[PDB]
Amino acid sequence: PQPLGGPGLGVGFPGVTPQRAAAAGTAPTFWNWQRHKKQHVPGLLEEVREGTFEQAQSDALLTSLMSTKLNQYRDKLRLIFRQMDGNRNSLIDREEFIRGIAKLRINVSKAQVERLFDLCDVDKSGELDYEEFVNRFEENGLASAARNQTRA
Amino acid sequence: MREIVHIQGGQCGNQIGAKFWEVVSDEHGIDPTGTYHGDSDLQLERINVYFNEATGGRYVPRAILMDLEPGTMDSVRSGPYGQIFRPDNFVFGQTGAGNNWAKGHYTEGAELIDSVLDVVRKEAESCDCLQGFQVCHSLGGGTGSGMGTLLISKIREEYPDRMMLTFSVVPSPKVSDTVVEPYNATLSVHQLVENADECMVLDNEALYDICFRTLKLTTPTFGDLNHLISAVMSGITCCLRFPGQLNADLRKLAVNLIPFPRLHFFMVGFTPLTSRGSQQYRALTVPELTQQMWDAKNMMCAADPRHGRYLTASALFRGRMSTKEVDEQMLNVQNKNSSYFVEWIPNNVKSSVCDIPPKGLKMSATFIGNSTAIQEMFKRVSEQFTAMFRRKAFLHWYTGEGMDEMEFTEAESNMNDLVSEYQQYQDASAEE
Amino acid sequence: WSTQVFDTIQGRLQAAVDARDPAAIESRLKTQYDQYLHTTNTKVAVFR
Amino acid sequence: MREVISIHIGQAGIQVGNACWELYCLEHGIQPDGQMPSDKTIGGGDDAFNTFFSETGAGKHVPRCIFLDLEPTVVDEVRTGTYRQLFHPEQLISGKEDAANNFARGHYTIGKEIVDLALDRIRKLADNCTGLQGFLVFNAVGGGTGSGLGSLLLERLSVDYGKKSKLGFTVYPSPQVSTAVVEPYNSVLSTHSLLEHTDVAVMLDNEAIYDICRRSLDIERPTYTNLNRLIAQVISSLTASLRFDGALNVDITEFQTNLVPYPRIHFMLSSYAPIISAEKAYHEQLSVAEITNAAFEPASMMVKCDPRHGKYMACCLMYRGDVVPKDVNASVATIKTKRTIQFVDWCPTGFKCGINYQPPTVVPGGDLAKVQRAVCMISNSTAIGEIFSRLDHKFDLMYAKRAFVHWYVGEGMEEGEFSEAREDLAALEKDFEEVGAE
Amino acid sequence: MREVISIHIGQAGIQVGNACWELYCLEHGIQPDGQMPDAFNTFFSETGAGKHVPRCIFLDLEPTVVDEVRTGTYRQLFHPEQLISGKEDAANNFARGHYTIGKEIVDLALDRIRKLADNCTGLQGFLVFNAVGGGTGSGLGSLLLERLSVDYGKKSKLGFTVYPSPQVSTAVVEPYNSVLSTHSLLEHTDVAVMLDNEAIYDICRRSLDIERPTYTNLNRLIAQVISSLTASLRFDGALNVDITEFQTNLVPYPRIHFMLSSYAPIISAEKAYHEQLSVAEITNAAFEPASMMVKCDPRHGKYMACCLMYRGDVVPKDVNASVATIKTKRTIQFVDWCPTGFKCGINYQPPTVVPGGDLAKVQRAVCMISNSTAIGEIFSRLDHKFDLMYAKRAFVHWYVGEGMEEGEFSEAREDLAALEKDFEEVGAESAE
Amino acid sequence: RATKQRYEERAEMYDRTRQQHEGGSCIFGRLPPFHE
Ligand SMILES: Nc1nc2c(ncn2[C@@H]2O[C@H](COP(=O)(O)OP(=O)(O)OP(=O)(O)O)[C@@H](O)[C@H]2O)c(=O)[nH]1
Ligand SMILES: Nc1nc2c(ncn2[C@@H]2O[C@H](COP(=O)(O)OP(=O)(O)OP(=O)(O)O)[C@@H](O)[C@H]2O)c(=O)[nH]1
Ligand SMILES: Nc1nc2c(ncn2[C@@H]2O[C@H](COP(=O)(O)OP(=O)(O)O)[C@@H](O)[C@H]2O)c(=O)[nH]1
Ligand SMILES: [Mg+2]
Ligand SMILES: [Mg+2]
């Protein structure tokens, strides 16, 4: 006999009901509550907006961040090139470059990655080489000095 | 018709007492808004013991809510069943005790205990006849210990003929959550043996062993401990709120458990605690509730009941149940192992039957144990205090608020007198 | 049991083993193994 | 409202605060513009940002910080950086000439004029706050401005704002690698200034952070920007409990009541447990016992002294994110049984645990990866006596020939109180020995 | 939970290690990325881990074979901390792997052992995979085995060492490395299993019609032997053979712990359909000398203890019939002091096939691990190679210069001559 | 309320993602947090 009829709302007995009150619960609601959107690098732009000073600053800051990330070991640039080629060829494709940037975990938009790939592709072969990669990501290359050179 | 006034104190007592108001409001049918929606007429039988009246059928608890930091009353009010408390009872400080007994008892407590007592005197004068004051707090804390025991001293002078239940948590011997816990524990007990009428000792690392091994909970969160505590504090009062065959009020459990005014420390237990997956595997019966009651791994105190003889004991059975089976089982547990019970008290164990079981189960029981084995918990706290006080460690944070070092001397002289008094009655024979 | 059975048979066993000098064992095992390898070299498979 | 004021003195202080407030803007969602975007349907998140940001007008949040320096070349980088709009234009305080590694200029000659403007901005920020909890002072011991102006500022804050706690995060001179010659002179003079004025001190060693970045973030060419980023994780996790609710809240007054036994011993250590890089992380969740063990390892500790020599007088653990109260007790219990770490005989139970509910955040492009659990451990130990006697030897062999003294005595400072700072440091070395002795 | 930690040392250890974990992941359905294929499923896949990490360690002083695993198809299954590399290889020298350059890595290797031992709940044994012809397999293998006996007791050590072929070898100092390594396997390894490359070639050439086999073809069926012997722990069956069942029934004496191996149904894809593969004829083909993984004739010696482990749909009725047909043959000879000479284990899971592998899908298989006195035939040939090379004392200045002394050569040789005497004494019979 | 509920629900989902029998635990391990 249950003279106290009904399961009721709120917590009940230990081993009978969960800790959470039945008034507020019984559903996996807040397991992924973040309270804030992911914050980008302040210099980057989601859209392209080419031909502008803000785009020049975004490209310069992105290349400087990439250079500082890839020039930490003595041979981190070669190691990252090896980890990013993927298809065992010595060249790097668009999807492999995208996957490498995602592995480096910099929150960069797809169009901005494509723009960086286009500036890296000096010979316009549709495919980066080791020379193009290292020339863009030297430790104090001209694309890194473009961060200092804002007035152009 | 007789009412119990609940006081919760500090960060520890607020979250512990919040879960107590989680379970009683559901077990009496109060929804989070404050109205009534249960379909049982026994829920509305004795609501006055823990709920007041309001317009439109609203029932608000007799709770005075206390801490020196306003952070916890943001957390208490935000959850479910947090809107049922009156905001006038949300008396809060600004600075915070910060795990210092001196700040809670002397400086920041005396500036706040005047406004707190006005809330308590409001609730005492409102109801018909006080059964007693129930307090849930901490001993190693700063607000539940420093200013919690300040309220106990103040409210004992104003109401000296009333009961006093203290569900106070104690530091663990294995791992301590605060470095200055032995200072705050030893100062609290000296202020608590003279004032508090009876006391229930809780320990977190006894509850961790309960959660891991009885509830099969691999990663027990901080509030699952409170729900085990909340069921006992609801189970301590089952005879008051509901009819039964034998009724045991707070004073009835006082007279049957403390033989002497200074031996008022209990270790408390909780019987029908099986895992969720074992609800069909465990066959519930009166021998099964009795067997898990006296098991030493079931006790919510860190002290081992097999080390010291049980002075007295009490059982609060709930549910439609046979009075002969308990009465045969209580004789059986006393006569199977007589070495764990003191010889000069016949009938160590008191039994009370409430015929209305809790929600979801048809039989339940709550165990109160007045054992001399609780001196082992007091001796471990004593050993910590003597090791620290000899070299005056962490003492400038206590003498800064006016508590001289002479106050710490009698905090130990009544501490070691407890374990001396608990040792003698254990060693006491029927003759001498 | 020990003295009547186990000590006696272990004495016989250790006496025969100590009589056996090890170089004879390596010579005999080398000859047998070389015979097996010669058969499995010049013959299409060995079957039990 | 629980709310603190962070002062950053000198080049090292203002460069840490550039990275310290960078993480504070990202936890509370404050943009570099200074405006908080509307999120879901909430009336207000006032208790979250009020500890660091004051709501001004409509949707504008300004920090409760003072960036004061005698040189303008390090404060104008903030004024032209990404956060040019966030700060109040007069909270950033510049000077004409720097102290230039001179403790005499920062205390007597040129630091006297600029300290008057500091208290004017402190009094205005103290008036804005309802309940102030404590001043978090960030400075460099080895620099002229940080040691000099920091000594004058903390003396003024003690007289005006009595008994309010002062948590000192001081960059301290390193045993082997250091960037300046007269650092042992500037280190010994400010020690007497911060012995009795600040209440909790956290020693930060630059070579110790170099060792941590080399073996945890696997970078052997770090930058001070990388160094100050995981300094920011230490301070943010330390005051994480004021910002966000948790099971075991630990406030600033909770720190000084548990982490110092005696008034003259308050020099602490620092360690941040899960430090995994962006690429190395993949999907790696670490156990609570693993990160607790990694916190107490001597290699993962942020001041250059070995805890194996000294005795842990007091210790606290700030846990963040999805950590339960049980496994922290299981983690502590095996630390007590681990004999390679030792506690003093007069502190048999010496742990404090603070569990906050907010998982730590990561800056974009930062080296640290997104982790759901973290331990920030600051502990008091007698191993600081190795630190203070290390540059005591450096100062003793320098003062004997009286080299680099004509600069100090020329700028108003007297000859005789070099020995006052040395005898005060001598008494501090004796204090650590007799307290830790069994 | 029952578990075994495996250790793969050297070139041959982790090339088998690539093959064994290829078969291990396919048996349990584990994908190459490590994850076995509504709100909980999102939680279980990204924030938590449904990933299963192997309990193995891949250590070698030469990085080229280690980074092949780091850059291969199984780069995500293994922890990056789990695979251990080095600067310079031991370079076909027991002296370098045991004294000079194996000493620096063996301290790092035991740290990852300690992390794998703490991760498990209950440990049962240790698998060691190495080659006794190479310096890293012999030197670092002996160094790791010597240290594993110190820190860990009551935990068995299983050895699968690829011993050199009598005819063909890929090295010239091959007799020196195996003699010195043999003294370590007698002293520190609980169970060691001989493996001979030339015998695997003959199995691949004849019964599996591969004219041009490589090491990838060899390791695919050596992994079949290793996976079958520990398969009773992973899967259930009618009769189980645990890792402690294996010791207690195949070592009559502590020094004799050398066992052969055999896999019965080595049949290609084309030949499978015409072949009738019942329990009666695979066991007859299990004892076939052409089907043994060690190039030795078992008819030279006599079996002491033999364990027949079965996979697939095998009833216990016909494995007993296969026992009786073997015991009545005059070519298969048992020693007189072991009447009950067989242990039969049945596992219900049929043997999985590697995709692209040479072996076909069969529903019955026998993994025959037998203790025989024909191991002394193997060690006698390897001894005569050692005696000719040590008479001129060639290839000794490499060993003497890198830490070892001259006396270790005669000491390890003297232990092997005892083993030659030990088989001739134990295998002796009592007649009339 | 959202922060505390997130903490409680993540604790509950840790409880449910432990005590899960993979069946191939002889040679595989989930991860140290689930092997605590
Ligand atoms: N950790 C850390 N330390 C720094 C940083 N910047 C400077 N330092 C320390 O500062 C010391 C040099 O003194 P500074 O702080 O630059 O001098 P100052 O405080 O500006 O005093 P003046 O130069 O006279 O104005 C060096 O030894 C560094 O250890 C930083 O960004 N991070
Ligand atoms: N079955 C099998 N045996 C192999 C394989 N690779 C090497 N071996 C054995 O290894 C022996 C050669 O010695 P290694 O194992 O290569 O020596 P190592 O492990 O490189 O040790 P170091 O030379 O000191 O670096 C040969 O005789 C083979 O029997 C393999 O892939 N499969
Ligand atoms: N069982 C239980 N124990 C708690 C709870 N909250 C705090 N504690 C314990 O209380 C001690 C700390 O209390 P504290 O916050 O310092 O109390 P205060 O100083 O009065 O605010 C710790 O040992 C905790 O284990 C709770 O909700 N349940
Ligand atoms: Mg400067
Ligand atoms: Mg090799």
What is the helix (H) or strand (E) element at residue E234, kind and residue range? Answer: helix E231-234
User: E258-259 and E191-196 as β-strands: parallel, antiparallel, unpaired?
Assistant: parallel
Ligand 2 atom 3: residue of nearest CA? E12
| A abuts C (3+ Cβ pairs < 8 Å) | no
Cβ atoms of E125 and E243 closer than 8 Å: yes
Distance in Å, CA E221 to ligand 5 centroid = 22
**Please, is E197 exposed, middle or buried when counting C-beta atoms within 10 Å of its C-beta (0-12, 13-18, 19+)?**
buried
Please state, in angstroms and rounded to a whole number, the distance separating the CA atoms of residues D200 and D263. Answer: 10
E49 in contact with D at a CB cutoff of 8 Å? Answer: yes
From chain A, pick out residues whose CB is under 8 angstroms from the CB of D365: 41, 65, 69, 106
> Is A35's CB within 8 Å of D39's CB?
yes
User: N- to C-terminal Cα distance for chain B?
Assistant: 44
Is E64 exposed, middle or buried (CB count within 10 Å of its CB: 0-12, 13-18, 19+)?
exposed
Contact present, D355 and D248 (Cβ < 8 Å): yes
Tokens at residue B254, please?
A: 């006082």
The residue whose CB lies within 8 Å of the most ligand 1 atoms, and thus the one to mutate among D171, D182, D231, is D171
Q: Which atom of ligand 1 is nearest to the CA of D105?
A: 24
Query: To 10 degrees, what angle do helices D111-128 and D144-160 make?
Result: 50
B226 is in an annotated binding site: yes
Q: Could you identify the atom of ligand 1 that is nearest to the CA of residue D180?
A: 27
In one-letter notation, the amino acid at residue D422 is R
What are the angstrom distances between the C-alpha of E166 and each of A70, C25, E205, E216, E385?
52, 18, 18, 21, 9
Cα–Cα distance measured from residue B376 to residue D78, given in angstroms and rounded to the nearest whole number: 60
Alpha-carbon gap, residue B17 to E270, rounded angstroms: 76
How far is Cα D430 from Cα B172, in angstroms, rounded to an integer? 35
Q: Does E52 touch chain F (CB under 8 A)?
A: yes
Instruction: Compute the CA torsion angle F8, F12, F14, F20 (nearest 10 deg).
Output: 180
- In what side-by-side order are the strands of the sheet with E56-59? E83-84, E56-59, E4-9, E125-131, E156-163, E191-196, E258-259, E364-372, E303-312, E342-347
CB F34 within 8 A of CB E48: yes
Check CB contact under 8 Å for D349 and B71: no
Instruction: Please spell the DSSP secondary structure of B333-367, one letter per residue.
Output: HHHH-GGGB-TT-SS-EEEEEESS--TT-S-EEEE
Contacts 24+ apart (CB under 8 A), E247-251: E247/E156, E247/E190, E247/E191, E249/E305, E249/E307, E249/E343, E250/E191, E250/E305, E250/E306, E250/E307, E250/E343, E250/E369, E250/E370, E250/E371, E251/E190, E251/E191, E251/E305, E251/E371
Strand duo E364-372 + E303-312: pairing = antiparallel
| Record: contact A37-D369, CB cut-off 8 A | no
Q: Which of E245, E275, E281, E420 is catalytic?
A: E245
For residue B40, give the amino acid letter.
S
Please name the helix (run of DSSP H) or strand (run of DSSP E) that holds residue D331, with its range, or none. Answer: helix D325-337
* Residues within 8 A of D (CB atoms), A 100-129 only: 103-107
Active site (catalytic) residues of D: 254
How many C-beta neighbours within 10 Å does residue A46 have?
13
E356 vs B362, D93, E205, E269, CA distance in Å? Answer: 63, 72, 17, 11
Q: Residues 6 or more apart from A27 whose CB is under 8 A from it?
A: none
Binding-site residues, ligand 2, Cβ < 6 A: E 10-12, 15-16, 62, 89-92, 131, 133-137, 162, 164, 169-171, 197, 215, 218-219, 222
Q: Put residue A25 in one of left, alpha, beta given phi > 0 → left and psi -120 to 50 → alpha.
A: left
Phi first, then psi: give them for residue A118, nearest 5 degrees: -65, -40
Q: Which two tokens stand for residue B320?
A: 């439609």
- Between CA B208 and CA B203 the distance in angstroms is 9
Which tokens hold the place of D46?
């006032």
- Report yes or no: B269 and B370 within 8 Å, Cβ to Cβ: no
- Whether D226 has a binding-site annotation, put simply, is no
In order of B196, B292, D371, the CA distances from B215 in angstroms are 32, 13, 30
> Around Cβ E149, how many Cβ atoms within 10 Å?
17
Supply angle C-alpha B356, B360, B361, rounded to 5: 60
Bridge partners of B203, per DSSP, are B170
- Check F8 against B223: CB less than 8 A apart: yes
CB neighbour burial string for D347-360, b if at least 16 within 10 angstroms, e if fewer: bbbbbbbbbbbbbb
Whole-angstrom distance, CA of residue B11 vs CA of residue B16 = 9
Nearest in space to D266 (alpha carbons), one of D274, D278, D275, D257: D257
| CB-based touch F/B (3+ pairs, under 8 A) | yes
The residue nearest atom 6 of ligand 2, judged by CA position, is: E12
What 8-state DSSP symbol labels residue E45? Answer: I
Is D186 assigned to a binding site? no
CA-D224 nearest atom, ligand 1 = 31
**What DSSP letter does each residue of B240-276 carry, written as one string?**
HHS-BSS---HHHHHHTT-SSTT--EEEEEE-----S
Residue of chain E nearest A27, judged by CA positions: E39
Q: Atom 14 in ligand 1: which residue has the minimum CA distance?
A: D143
Q: Which residues contact D304 (CB under 8 A, 6 or more apart)?
A: D174, D175, D205, D207, D208, D211, D387
For residue A40, the 8-state DSSP code is P
Point out which residues pair with E27 in neighbouring strands. none
- Compute the distance between CA of residue B63 and CA of residue B59 in angstroms, rounded to an integer: 12
From residue D161, alpha-carbon distances to A22, A101, D127 in Å are: 49, 51, 12
Q: What number of residues does chain A have?
A: 152
Cβ within 8 Å of residue D405, ≥6 positions away: D399, D415, D418
- The owner of tokens 């104090």 is A140
Is B10 annotated in a binding site? The answer is no
Q: How many angstroms separate the alpha carbon of residue E83 from the centre of ligand 2?
A: 18
CA atoms within 13 A on the CB side of B241: 25
- Does the beta carbon of D205 lie inside 6 Å of ligand 1? no
* CA gap C8, C5 in Å, rounded: 5
Residue D71 annotated in ligand binding: yes
Cβ of F12 under 8 Å from any chain B Cβ?
Answer: yes
